[PDB]
């Protein structure tokens, strides 16, 4: 029964403890780039508690014939930092300490293709994840095999046109809802709430934000800045001219992207506004947007990387991520949510083998509760 049997208690989320801790760290990619064989072996802490970890990589047989910036993704999920209000949703450490599998497929825009078969398991005490790439027609004289790329990780960029644009549409899109524009003239928050919090539905924006005709919050993603007054100065252009506009300044969460737009009844006047925004942080990091997957009983994952070529622009590589467990016991798939990476690319001073120097946070955003 319930009581004739597992460990744990009395205060967590999974048996996945194993990373409260700074847990060491091995990894080894077998590689074939359209014949050019290589191998790639590294060490490293990872502190999953504070979504960082450094290592550092090592070529095993000679000059690395691809960019090292293109193994970056390729070479532990693991480690993201999960806040306790998220901690239900943390598929990676699920898998621990018995380990999932970790299938990608990295498009290279304009390029070839990597595609790797990897597993993140257990050995001891220490975390261990081996890789099997396969690289497919690859222009030899292309920006990977003519290893034409920046040593930067890299990435979202820049200044900011796409998201700018992307940010607008989302405010203007729904400052015309017609419930919406009923529900804020009629100061409804819970109906507010109701036609708001489904839009937040698959993670991407950091925030929306509705204000009435006056700035005063009517909706914000934390709960106790409903009915305080917007931050950041720049919203007199929507709520008194009623013009959309994208706009950078700091808000109640720090610098901010953000595109504003009035709601307007049948007659013209705005009767109030919606912030749809990015912070600054997250503008400068890398997103995996990763959804749960019940046919293979695991995640499936979708991003993108710029990869900064120099003298020139840019080299887009676009992933295709889908993980399994190994071994099948109990589950945590999480519902829509995101990660958010941030790593540098450093060299050791005293190795002199092709190798790298990585350093990443990684920390998951995308649920506020």
């Known amino acids: 029964y319930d009581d004739d049997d597992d460990p744990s208690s009395r205060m967590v989320s999974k048996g ?23 191998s790639v072996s590294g060490e490293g802490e990872g502190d999953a508690t504070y ?33 306790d209000h998220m901690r239900q949703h943390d598929f990676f450490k699920s898998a621990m300490p018995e380990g999932y599998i970790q299938e990608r497929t990295i498009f290279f825009k304009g ?18 994840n081996r890789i099997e790439l396969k690289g497919a027609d690859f222009r030899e004289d292309g920006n990977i095999l003519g290893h034409k790329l920046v040593y930067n990780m890299v990435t979202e960029e820049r200044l900011h046109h796409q998201v700018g644009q992307r940010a607008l549409i989302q405010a203007m899109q729904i400052s015309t809802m017609p419930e919406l524009v009923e529900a804020v003239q009629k100061r409804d928050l819970a109906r507010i709430k109701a036609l708001i919090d489904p839009m937040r539905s698959f993670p991407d924006a950091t925030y929306i934000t509705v204000g009435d005709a006056s700035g005063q919050r009517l909706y914000h993603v934390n709960p ?37 737009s009035p709601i307007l009844d049948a007659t013209g006047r705005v009767v109030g506004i919606v912030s749809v925004g990015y912070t600054i942080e997250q503008l400068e990091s890398n997103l995996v947007y990763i959804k749960a997957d019940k046919q293979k009983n695991g995640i499936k994952a979708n991003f993108h990387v710029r990869h900064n070529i120099e003298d020139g622009g840019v080299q887009l590589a676009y992933h295709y991520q889908q993980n399994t467990p190994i071994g099948d016991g109990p589950v945590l798939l999480p519902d829509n949510h995101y990660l958010s990476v ?28």
């Open 16 to 38: 996945e403890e194993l990373f409260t801790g700074v847990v060491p760290i091995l990894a080894e990619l077998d590689g074939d780039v359209n014949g050019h064989k290589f």
């Open 51 to 83: 979504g960082k970890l450094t290592m550092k990589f090592i070529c095993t047989t000679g000059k690395l014939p691809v960019p090292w910036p293109t193994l970056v993704t390729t070479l532990v999920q693991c480690f993201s930092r999960y806040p």
């Open 111 to 128: 390029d070839g293709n990597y595609k790797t078969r990897a597993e993140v398991k257990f050995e001891g005490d220490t975390l261990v």
């Open 224 to 260: 106790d800045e409903i009915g305080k007054s917007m931050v950041g100065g720049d919203s007199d252009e929507a709520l008194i001219n009623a013009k959309g506009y994208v706009s950078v300044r700091k808000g109640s969460l720090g610098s901010s992207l953000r595109g504003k």
């Open 342 to 369: 941030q790593s540098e690319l450093s060299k050791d001073p005293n190795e002199k083998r092709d190798h790298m120097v990585l350093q990443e946070h990684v920390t998951a955003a995308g649920i506020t509760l």
